Amino acid sequence: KNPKSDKFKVKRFHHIEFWCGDATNVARRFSWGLGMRFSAKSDLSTGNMVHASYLLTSGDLRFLFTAPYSPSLSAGEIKPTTTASIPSFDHGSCRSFFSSHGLGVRAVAIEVEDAESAFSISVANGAIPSSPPIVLNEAVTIAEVKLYGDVVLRYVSYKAEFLPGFERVEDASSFPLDYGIRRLDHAVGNVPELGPALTYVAGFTGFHQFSGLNSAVLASNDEMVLLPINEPVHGTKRKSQIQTYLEHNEGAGLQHLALMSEDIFRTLREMRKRSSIGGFDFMPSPPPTYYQNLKKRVGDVLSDDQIKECEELGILVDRDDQGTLLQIFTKPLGDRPTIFIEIIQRVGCMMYQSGGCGGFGKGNFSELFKSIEEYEK
């Protein structure tokens, strides 16, 4: 049952904004390691005395990296006169956020028909306001509400590139890197209690519901905005990875971004080539027993040679009644064992492909326990 109960018209994931200590170095690392392109900037060179913000792009995926300058550069300004390109920015909030959680996602940003209506409707249905609707250069409206922890859901709407006050970087400083990543598939939040977190977000949005954790997934009408949310399952054998997150993150926050790749084989080859020269490390591979068993589960979908490629790259494979999902997980993206990244590609549900085709991999919890189980042998 898809009740399509959204309370305002949501379109797509628009961007993810990281709050940094130093935006430059995270942006350069992420660019090289994910093959994302340096496409826009707002900083000193464009007259922003408040924050440094650098946008990376791959396909439809937009990663924004932001850090505060010294307040002494903008102590004279007031909000009416600000040189900030992003009006919700605040030195104190950014410094507090970062020193509390370390590097991670401040904003999950979705495009909507009308940011102002979306904010108003959201607040009227219980959303905590974070930044009111502000209109940028008669062209873009942006507003923010609290999602979970210090992560805000940012609404973005356009009259008719990224934001006013941002510049395009010309092709010379912009190396056309591309490892095949094309859009944001879903963003996952870790929370102390699932129940209330769900009730809060589905309450103001209208989104419907799509070892060591329970998890539910909230989705927009066409199910292209997918927001899973985890809670820890306490008391079990191995410590819950969700609780580990909450302890190292200092509370709730975004756990991982799933990035869709048009060719997860090329993406993972390119990313793995670069792991140890500035890129991202991947999580430990599953035992070969997992790939032996892959023929039984997915034989009618991937050839032996394709499945062979999966085991070279450590790619995981799940499937449900509608479709089949390929996935792999990076090790943490920075100092703390908190936020990480998933690479996914989905096979099926063709009509365009329906969002979430094949699920999110919960079968792979089971397939991995049993995987080692025989591997031990």
Contact (Cβ atoms closer than 8 angstroms) between residue 270 and residue 166: no
What is the C-alpha to C-alpha distance for residues 189 and 285, in angstroms, rounded to an integer? 24
248 binds a second copy (CB under 8 A): yes
3-state secondary structure of 82: coil
Residues 142-201 touching a second copy, rule: CB under 8 A, are: 172-175, 177
Residue 125 or 174 with smaller CB distance to a second copy: 174
State yes or no: 256 annotated in a binding site.
Answer: yes
**Strand-pair partners of 329:** 342
First to last CA, the chain: 43
Under rule CB under 5 A, which residues in 333-362 are in contact with Co ion? 342, 360
> CA separation (Å) from 14 to 92, 111, 180, 224?
25, 5, 18, 11
Residues lying near ligand A1LWP in the complex (CB under 6 A):
188, 215, 217, 228, 230, 241, 283, 329, 340, 342, 360-362, 364-365
Min dist. Cβ of residue 115 to ligand A1LWP (A) = 27
Provide the pairing of β-strand 323-329 with 140-148: unpaired
The verdict on 337 binding a second copy (CB under 8 A) reads: yes
- Does residue 258 interact with Co ion by CB under 5 A? yes
Mapping DSSP to helix (H, G, I), strand (E, B) and coil, where does residue 199 land?
helix
Considering the complex, state which of residue 51 and residue 256 has its C-beta at the smaller distance from ligand A1LWP. Answer: 256
Residue 173's binding partner among a second copy, ligand A1LWP, Co ion, none (Cβ under 5 to 8 angstroms by kind) is: a second copy
Q: Does 277 bind a second copy (CB under 8 A)?
A: yes
100 near a second copy, judged by CB under 8 A: yes
Within 10 A of 161 (CB to CB), how many other CB atoms are there?
11
Q: Which of 2, 336, 8, 22 is nearest to 145 (CA)?
A: 8
Angle between helices 115-124 and 194-205 (to 10 degrees): 130
Q: Which does 364 bind (CB under 5 to 8 A by kind): ligand A1LWP, Co ion, a second copy, none?
A: ligand A1LWP
- Residue numbers in the known binding site for Fe cation are 186, 256, 342
Task: Name the residues that contact a second copy, by CB under 8 A.
Answer: 20-26, 28-29, 31-33, 38, 43-44, 52, 67, 69-70, 72-73, 95, 98-100, 102-103, 172-175, 177, 247-248, 250, 276-279, 281, 333-337
